[PDB]
Ligand binder design. Structure first.
Ligand code: HEM
Ligand code: HEM
Ligand code: NA
Ligand code: NA
Lengths: 713, 713
């Protein structure tokens, strides 16, 4: 059947904003996963997992009699999709069980790993999410094999449909770079927001870049892709060597024996895929990646044998039985055990990317340190494994259960505890009036609270107004935040704060994070008052202020808005049209299309634009909260054309006289062009809509102000 | 960006079931359009529409100074997409304002028509939907030009995204027949459920079939497409001649002058399209279809001139200025007015399809009668226009406002009014006990109520259990309904009913329609008891019994389920896979994916399959309401394979011994294969889910039993 996407493949896609409806969710609307998990007997789940590790099923026999390696790979691929550029991917939604990730070639045979866990999932039911279970199973694998983990937090609620993620534009799985849809340009520059080298890989190609078995060149791709997943050199070497202490790869025969991936398989396969025609199709005959490497002499026990082998042999380029490039130890004895036959042993083997840890000069230094000091290795791996598996979970207030590590880590963007009474409703009213009497304008108040709260992204639950990080580096100097104006507003608010807190007894005080949001609330109330409407904007205290020393400046860079349609801002010239970037930002904000539309229309007439641009400011009563944006955009008396100077700026002229009335960008005019957005604009631009517009605007403002408030969850 | 659809283009699409969520809807979840409409000053709206008719706008000047013909076309296109095969399309959701219909070639320049209406839409706001407005505007056009309409009902709630409809498989707009995705096969057989001859047409090609200007062959296409929109010969001739009493076509220059359709136009076009480079682009220079025909000597006044011209001249084949085939009256004088120049007149002209009304022998007779008896023409057209514009609105209980016609019409599937006391809860308990004491089984009770209720479709709100039409022709003889079993159940229920009604005082009685539903309820209650659960099923009385003479047998044929996955039924071999048909049916039933899943699982264990088929009956306790379907489907101890006899039937055998345990169809096994469906099955097949399964099943059972209960709305 031909679809709208077929006919108009470049039109903007609003359905990304309408996922995750209560319709698609089988749980009740009252289901609260955290409440279910907090009653789970986590110790009993772990005992069942521990038993499973050595309880081989004949339809996918356990290598060495132990599933630990397979489950550690499963948990590392679950977390491994994560990109710091947008926070999308990672383990936090259990997305490995849905398309497309369930069928990526790098996830081959993890369908078998997830199937092994269904009996446990079935026993415990809604009290443990798939998303938590995947991670927990990798921790229990590690523990079962003698490795002491750093801890574990539950709280990843399950999802029920695939996430909308840009994974690249290639139309061929595993396409080598340089094709018509190349994700590389320039001197091997990977396009943002991607974090893998080929479509359907986790990070890099285990043979080498585009299959070229050079460990030095492979190291460049390892470093780049791992940096794009928020991991530095130490963390990288710890993770790779740590993982490859366990288990083996599977390449016993030619890959042409392996059938359809799960989404393409027949119905009788009941959710599994890569059925193999080679010998038994499993166990000793398994084919997953096509490589056939076993790294250590004890694949089912933690050791420091990865580095002993890496450094204690010289390495020779060879081929697996599937034809893939891999390496074998020169002159070595057969000291590695076979996975099924106790009478067979094998020579040490390595992947090209393993040898990167010895041949790249910066990795070599760390690998050597870890080789000489395996206690340092164990500690770095444990910390990195925790970070890997929790990086998308958001603030530590979301972490559940009895194994949460107490140590506060800088990557968590930590918020200090609140240890004093909070302001009440009367205090909030007094502080709003003080803010308004200071002479700060609606535009200043709204702009500053917008800037603070709108760093949030639901993809990894980073950002938001909690922390008052807007006053710190690097946020205070981001161009979108209008540094000189921001500094003047923050100075006035800090004076208000000092005076209020100095007057209290009993230790009550207000944080600057709370006052920034409260001040934005006073601005919106004042704009409504300027329009003739008395409203109260809701406000919930309890935010705290983080220090510079608790803020990783380099990690914060990815939260910089380089495109923020809500402030009609674009930092420079992109390939993707600005309206597509607006929709992307609304998705990260967790907004629907109606929420996006109301919010943008109001912000324009409040004076939220960066630099006080007139683009889209379709009103003659700026700083009054009215539906004027919609009424004027919809006025057929105005004709619009692109300017000669700039095809992305439009002039609106009176159709009859030619007089200039307005200017706008693509982000403004999309609301009058897109057939779904225009239909929303019509509702708010109708003669009966002023009350509705104000109410809906206040509701979406308060939603944005509270996005990171998992302390009130 | 590559999407799951790109990778796996034949996968099933569940997002059709989660459309129309409260997320995409700008109105609050409590908004009730019926209540808004009932307060609308409909008389004021009509006055504004009357004024608009002759208020010409310079950007799309009114032909003959009067927009009436353009608006009649606009309303007839809004209604004209309707297909009786599935009830999809029609005017009832205002879908002409969204993709793809806003940009269909046959809808060219109706974007102008809808834009002219925005000021009225703006003024009245939420109190009149677009969908009602398009139809009311067509009514007012007719009345303004001297034609008295049969009536009008409001109540068509607006929708906020495109409907998921199969419009065909062609990838080229307007593709002629016989291509790689031909909608025709055999002797000009149109594929169900399509009701138009080419992609992006309303019904037929105005030049003739595939552009061949043969009026006799065109008549065959007219008759077939109109029948597939629920219109017979009389209604068809009345509609065509009636419409073509007004206005004109537009084909002033070559079609190569017309630019992009609205969904392809640039952002500056602000929602309009088909911008023309021919002369002024508009008015006298307009190009819409490419034809240039004006039918009558008074295009802005109702007249009997259509048939005078059709019969009073002989016709010669000619070309419009765009090169399209049309007809001109041989030897006629220049009697037709020009739309813009008072000094110009034109000869009478006709479309091929107009000439069909004279040259097809069965139409000719009707046309002549209308020519000779113009009052019969006026009456037929009035009634057909009402039917055209209301055929998708459902039961008369949904009709709102002060212009609703009192006359009850056969195509409304009318239900008699209830004029007696209804049964109360004590009566309901006594009747359930009687049903259970009669010896009717769970399987019999559930199957019969399912058969009665599940004819409903939300596309045109036809069908459902109200009316007890399951006892009448043709429902009582449908193969899916198991005619011999149905007859035995109905005979026992009618004897129960006769005995209850014969014992009452006052006028209290129970309809058979209510008793069928009630008896189904007692079945479900008994099945829960068989499983150890104490469950009360909600029941609402008030259904009435329709007569045979109130049940048009030919119109009822389209509700026949030829595929019903809920009863594992397929009437024959189709090209579309059965699991796609299941999803299609769930959409017509208004079900979400979780509802479809829970419903199907329960029906299988209750014995609702046609012919007592064992396929999907994954339980050892049939007629007990348990989650066994899910627990057994998910058991990895069973391996599944297609049979040699039949690739659509699957055997599930013990993995270790090979012993046969179950058989299933595609509909059954999709729940274990599709990655989304399997995620829902896992919830219900978990150890903690039995009570949830029961309660969710009772909820969705009750939902289906009430689909058509617009008397309680
Ligand atoms: C440069 C990064 C990496 C590359 C290129 C890579 C490559 C691979 C490949 C090709 C396999 C074989 C799949 C199969 O044929 O069964 C695999 C196995 C595995 N990897 Fe990695 N890997 C990477 C990093 C990691 C990380 C970070 C960890 C975990 C901390 C991990 C843990 C494992 C384990 C445990 C296995 C064994 C699976 C089994 O026993 O079934 N690897 N690796
Ligand atoms: C065989 C069925 C029909 C065919 C092929 C058809 C074809 C068309 C065509 C090609 C146009 C010209 C579009 C343009 O260039 O502006 C048109 C105009 C129109 N049709 Fe039809 N028609 C059909 C039935 C109907 C019916 C059922 C109605 C209404 C009851 C209707 C009412 C009109 C009106 C009022 C116009 C004039 C528009 C104007 O004045 O702007 N027609 N028809
Ligand atoms: Na994420
Ligand atoms: Na419909």
């Amino acid at each position: 059947g031909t679809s709208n996407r077929d006919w108009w493949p470049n039109q903007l896609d609003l359905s990304i904003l309408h996922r995750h409806s209560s319709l698609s969710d089988p749980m009740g609307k009252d289901f609260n996963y955290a409440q279910a998990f907090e009653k789970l007997d986590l110790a009993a789940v772990k005992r069942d997992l521990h038993a499973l590790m050595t309880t081989s099923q004949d339809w996918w026999p356990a290598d060495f009699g132990h599933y630990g390696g397979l489950f550690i790979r499963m948990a590392w691929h679950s977390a491994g999709t994560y990109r710091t550029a947008d926070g999308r991917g990672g383990a936090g939604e259990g997305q490995q069980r849905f398309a497309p990730l369930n069928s990526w070639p790098d996830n081959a045979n993890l369908d078998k790993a997830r199937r092994l866990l269904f009996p446990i999932k079935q026993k415990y039911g809604r009290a443990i999410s798939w998303a938590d279970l995947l991670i927990l199973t990798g921790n229990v694998a590690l523990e079962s094999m003698g490795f002491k983990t750093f801890g574990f937090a539950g709280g990843r609620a399950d999802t029920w449909e695939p996430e909308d993620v840009y994974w690249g534009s290639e139309k061929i799985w595993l396409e080598l770079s340089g094709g018509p849809n190349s994700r590389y340009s320039g001197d091997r520059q990977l396009e943002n927001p991607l974090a893998a080298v080929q479509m359907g890989l986790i990070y890099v190609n285990p043979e080498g870049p585009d299959g070229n078995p050079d460990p030095v060149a492979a190291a460049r791709d390892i470093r780049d892709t791992f940096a794009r997943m928020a991991m530095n050199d130490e963390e990288t070497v710890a993770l790779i060597a740590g993982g490859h202490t366990f288990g083996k790869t599977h390449g016993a025969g030619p890959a042409s024996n392996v059938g359809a991936e799960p989404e393409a398989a027949g119905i009788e396969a009941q959710g599994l895929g890569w059925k193999s025609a080679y010998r038994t199709g499993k166990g000793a005959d398994a084919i997953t990646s096509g490589l056939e490497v076993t790294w250590t002499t004890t694949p089912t026990q933690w050791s420091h044998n990865f580095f002993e082998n890496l450094f204690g042999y010289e390495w020779e380029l060879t081929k697996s039985p599937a034809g893939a490039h891999q390496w074998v130890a020169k002159g070595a004895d057969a000291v590695i055990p076979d996975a099924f036959d106790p009478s067979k042993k094998h020579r040490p083997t390595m992947l090209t990317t393993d040898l990167s840890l010895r041949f790249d000069p910066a990795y070599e230094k760390i690998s050597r340190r870890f080789h000489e000091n395996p206690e340092q290795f164990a500690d770095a791996f444990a910390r990195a494994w925790f970070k890997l598996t929790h990086r998308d979970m958001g603030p530590r207030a979301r972490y559940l259960g009895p194994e949460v590590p107490a140590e506060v880590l800088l990557w968590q963007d930590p918020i200090p505890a609140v240890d004093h009474p909070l302001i009440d409703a009367a205090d909030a009213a007094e502080l709003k009036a003080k803010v308004l009497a200071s002479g700060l304008t609606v535009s200043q108040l709204v702009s500053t609270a917008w800037a603070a709260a709108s760093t949030f992204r639901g993809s990894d639950k980073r950002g938001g107004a909690n922390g008052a990080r807007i006053r710190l580096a690097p946020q205070k100097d981001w161009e979108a935040n209008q540094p000189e104006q921001l500094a003047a507003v923050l100075e006035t608010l800090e004076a208000i704060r000092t005076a209020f807190n100095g007057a209290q007894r009993g230790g009550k005080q207000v944080s600057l994070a709370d006052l920034i949001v409260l001040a934005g609330c006073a601005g919106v109330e004042q704009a409504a008052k300027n329009a003739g409407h008395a409203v109260t904007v809701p406000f919930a205290p309890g935010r705290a202020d983080a220090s510079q020393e608790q803020t990783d400046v380099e990690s914060m860079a990815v939260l910089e808005p380089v495109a923020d349609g809500f402030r009609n801002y674009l930092k420079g010239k992109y390939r993707v049209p600005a309206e597509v970037l607006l929709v992307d930002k609304a998705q990260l904000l967790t907004l629907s299309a109606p929420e996006m539309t109301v919010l943008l229309g109001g912000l324009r007439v409040l004076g939220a634009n960066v630099g006080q641009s007139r683009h889209g400011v379709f009103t003659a009563r700026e700083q009054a909260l009215t539906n004027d944006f919609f009424v004027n955009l919809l006025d057929m008396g105005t004709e619009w054309k692109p300017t000669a100077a700039d095809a992305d700026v439009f002039e609106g002229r009176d159709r009859a006289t030619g007089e200039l009335k307005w200017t706008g960008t693509r982000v403004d005019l999309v609301f009058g062009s897109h057939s779904q957005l225009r239909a929303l604009a019509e509702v708010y631009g109708s003669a009966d809509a002023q009350e509705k517009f104000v109410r809906d605007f206040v509701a979406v403002w308060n939603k944005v102000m509270n996005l990171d408030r998992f302390d009130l969850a």
